[PDB]
Amino acid sequence: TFGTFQDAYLSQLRDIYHSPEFRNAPRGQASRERIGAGFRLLDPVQRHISVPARRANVVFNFAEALWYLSGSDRLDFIQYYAPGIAAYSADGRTLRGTAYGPRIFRHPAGGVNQWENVVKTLTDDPDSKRAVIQIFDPRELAVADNIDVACTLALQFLIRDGLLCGIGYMRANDAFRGAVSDVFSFTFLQEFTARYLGLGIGTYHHVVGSVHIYDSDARWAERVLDAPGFPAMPDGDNWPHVRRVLEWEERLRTNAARLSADALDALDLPAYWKHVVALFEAHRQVRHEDTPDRALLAALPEVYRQSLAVKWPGHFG
Amino acid sequence: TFGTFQDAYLSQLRDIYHSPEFRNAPRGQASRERIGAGFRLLDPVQRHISVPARRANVVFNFAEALWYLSGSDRLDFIQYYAPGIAAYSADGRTLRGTAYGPRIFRHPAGGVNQWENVVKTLTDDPDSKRAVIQIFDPRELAVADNIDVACTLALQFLIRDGLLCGIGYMRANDAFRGAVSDVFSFTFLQEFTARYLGLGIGTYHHVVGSVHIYDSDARWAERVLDARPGFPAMPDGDNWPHVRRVLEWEERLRTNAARLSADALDALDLPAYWKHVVALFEAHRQVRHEDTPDRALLAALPEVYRQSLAVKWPGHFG
Ligand SMILES: Nc1ccn([C@H]2C[C@H](O)[C@@H](COP(=O)(O)O)O2)c(=O)n1
Numbered sequence: 065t066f067g068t069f070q071d072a073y074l075s076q077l078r079d080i081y082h083s084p085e086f087r088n089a090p091r092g093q094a095s096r097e098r099i100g101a102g103f104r105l106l107d108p109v110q111r112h113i114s115v116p117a118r119r120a121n122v123v124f125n126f127a128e129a130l131w132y133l134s135g136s137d138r139l140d141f142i143q144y145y146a147p148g149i150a151a152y153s154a155d156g157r158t159l160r161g162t163a164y165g166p167r168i169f170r171h172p173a174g175g176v177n178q179w180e181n182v183v184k185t186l187t188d189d190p191d192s193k194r195a196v197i198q199i200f201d202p203r204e205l206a207v208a209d210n211i212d213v214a215c216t217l218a219l220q221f222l223i224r225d226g227l228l229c230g231i232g233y234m235r236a237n238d239a240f241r242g243a244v245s246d247v248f249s250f251t252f253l254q255e256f257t258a259r260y261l262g263l264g265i266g267t268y269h270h271v272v273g274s275v276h277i278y279d280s281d282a283r284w285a286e287r288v289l290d291a292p293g294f295p296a297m298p299d300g301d302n303w304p305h306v307r308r309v310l311e312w313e314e315r316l317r318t319n320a321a322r323l324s325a326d327a328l329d330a331l332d333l334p335a336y337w338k339h340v341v342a343l344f345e346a347h348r349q350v351r352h353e354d355t356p357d358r359a360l361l362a363a364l365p366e367v368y369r370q371s372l373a374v375k376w377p378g379h380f381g
Numbered sequence: 382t383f384g385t386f387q388d389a390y391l392s393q394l395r396d397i398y399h400s401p402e403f404r405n406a407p408r409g410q411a412s413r414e415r416i417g418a419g420f421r422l423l424d425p426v427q428r429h430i431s432v433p434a435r436r437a438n439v440v441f442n443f444a445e446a447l448w449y450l451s452g453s454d455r456l457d458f459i460q461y462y463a464p465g466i467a468a469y470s471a472d473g474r475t476l477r478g479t480a481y482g483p484r485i486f487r488h489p490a491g492g493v494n495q496w497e498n499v500v501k502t503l504t505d506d507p508d509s510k511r512a513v514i515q516i517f518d519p520r521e522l523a524v525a526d527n528i529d530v531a532c533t534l535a536l537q538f539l540i541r542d543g544l545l546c547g548i549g550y551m552r553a554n555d556a557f558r559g560a561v562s563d564v565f566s567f568t569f570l571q572e573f574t575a576r577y578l579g580l581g582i583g584t585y586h587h588v589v590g591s592v593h594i595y596d597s598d599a600r601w602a603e604r605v606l607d608a609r610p611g612f613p614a615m616p617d618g619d620n621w622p623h624v625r626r627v628l629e630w631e632e633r634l635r636t637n638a639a640r641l642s643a644d645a646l647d648a649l650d651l652p653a654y655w656k657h658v659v660a661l662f663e664a665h666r667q668v669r670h671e672d673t674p675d676r677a678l679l680a681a682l683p684e685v686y687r688q689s690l691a692v693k694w695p696g697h698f699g
């Protein structure tokens with residue numbers, strides 16, 4: 065049990081690095097590995113890694129979480145924030161097991177919007193043990209040479225003593241890279257759903273079949289091992305805000321618009337979501353080679369400024 | 382970490398009974414509960430509960446595991462061994478979330494035989510992290526007033542250092558009743574799959590979202606807490622031919638379309654391990670169809686099974 069994700073993350077990284085249960089090479093990928101490993105977080109809103117050597121990218125973090133909320137499988141959205149993700153796209157335009165959005169809101173087993181059913185299940189029966197969003201699908205194993213099979217099995221939500229608890233079940237998790245964004249996204253969905261339900265935040269449990277560090281990540285992982293609060297999302301239904309943020313996300317990503325510090329403050333959005341749009345504008349400055357905006361940076365929560373300053377030190381450091 | 386399931390079971394039962402995190406009533410069923418709980422078994426073949434006060438039913442245990450291997454959703458098969466299971470059948474003929482058989486071998490998502498795909502996945506890539514049997518289905522929460530929603534999410538198998546390890550992921554588990562037969566069946570499937578693959582047995586990991594004791598079981602649960610012969614190993618190799626023959630006898634004995642004396646059972650053309658399983662079904666047929674109990678049958682069984690039968694049906698085998 066850990067207070068914040070960062071303590072859990074580093075503890076697990078050290079466990080696998082120094083006392084791996086196995087060294088093997090699934091699909092030819094040499095790894096250190098522990099089996100059946102997990103942790104409990106007391107404060108899931110504190111979901112970020114702030115160790116500078118890790119260079120956690122808070123823009124990618126929100127982009128991935130919002131890509132899920134959009135229900136999209138499209139590669140162009142997410143590859144803008146992480147170009148290497150295209151290696152898991154077989155068709156050059158969509159992702160499969162990596163795209164949790166359609167698994168959540170239109171799962172290929174029946175076209176089901178599972179988030180809606182979870183919300184209704186917990187409204188009719190607050191004590192329910194059934195409020196599960198399934199991610200994995202039985203047909204992913206049916207064809208050989210699938211380059212992108214979902215590694216998350218399911219996400220569960222439970223209301224306990226007025227608080228929404230979350231549990232993520234995964235068959236496998238890259239403990240150095242994937243875990244950072246997976247825990248971010250799952251606790252983001254937990255918090256988003258809690259706000260929608262009008263509840264506080266309970267614990268988050270992460271449970272993983274194979275948790276591993278790729279040998280190709282060892283040097284960076286060693287660097288990380290040798291080495292301010294995350295803001296709370298506003299109460300209530302955040303779907304209207306998410307829709308407006310996604311409109312700005314696409315306009316900024318394609319460089320079809322840009323937002324000054326004053327334009328960002330004038331957005332018709334809660335402050336929390338204004339900061340997310342500001343992160344997309346900062347990212348647009350990087351990607352499309354526009355002037356880094358000192359005023360934008362100064363108005364962000366300190367957690368976000370630090371992430372930006374360490375990730376792109378030439379722009380925001 | 383525990384050596385055998387019985388140690389894990391009693392430890393967990395004590396945890397939930399004396400130190401529950403929550404007390405609540407999902408779907409109106411008052412319960413003691415802990416969230417996010419599990420254990421590891423170093424020797425999953427030792428999968429049985431022998432505490433006499435528990436009255437663990439080894440006939441049901443094998444029946445449920447073999448019901449799964451048969452791929453069946455039929456209620457008549459399984460309610461014969463556990464009459465109360467009929468409470469979860471909406472149509473009086475089939476089970477839904479309780480019937481893991483069809484989930485394993487012809488899952489509602491595409492009719493996929495996932496056991497074959499897992500075996501093929503692990504044959505092409507022994508180190509695979511993808512060898513998962515999905516149980517739960519997204520449409521189950523869309524059924525209004527669904528009385529039988531799968532509580533197992535998935536089962537995973539991994540070949541690690543020549544041993545087949547298994548992991549059961551559940552969203553919820555009844556720690557008094559369901560855990561006994563779920564861990565039995567899952568470790569049974571693990572061993573069965575390990576024999577087929579020519580591997581030894583590794584650890585079994587059980588991970589559960591809501592682990593709970595229903596208030597209506599509290600009295601029985603403390604009797605168990607207030608209170609060995611070893612479980613036999615399944616034979617090496619592909620056990621599907623034996624399973625097919627055992628399922629033929631299971632159906633004839635359950636419908637009283639056949640019966641076998643102790644000497645007839647000993648002479649069956651089956652490995653000893655499976656002959657004992659057929660003998661358990663013949664003994665159960667003697668109970669449920671009111672035939673003469675065969676004490677000679679009882680004497681030839683492994684002691685673990687003898688104890689189970691003697692405690693469960695003392696008038697017949699006690
Ligand atoms: N959201 C994601 C997507 C992928 N992975 C990592 C863990 C998997 O082990 C690996 C995919 O390889 P495989 O399918 O062989 O497990 O990617 C992860 O940790 N989180």
Ligand SMILES: Nc1ccn([C@H]2C[C@H](O)[C@@H](COP(=O)(O)O)O2)c(=O)n1
Nearest residue numbers: 193408530532553554555559560563
């Ligand atoms: N193979 C099974 C089937 C059912 N259950 C128990 C756990 C569930 O919590 C409960 C079903 O109720 P619910 O759907 O509300 O969780 O039955 C179990 O432990 N193992």
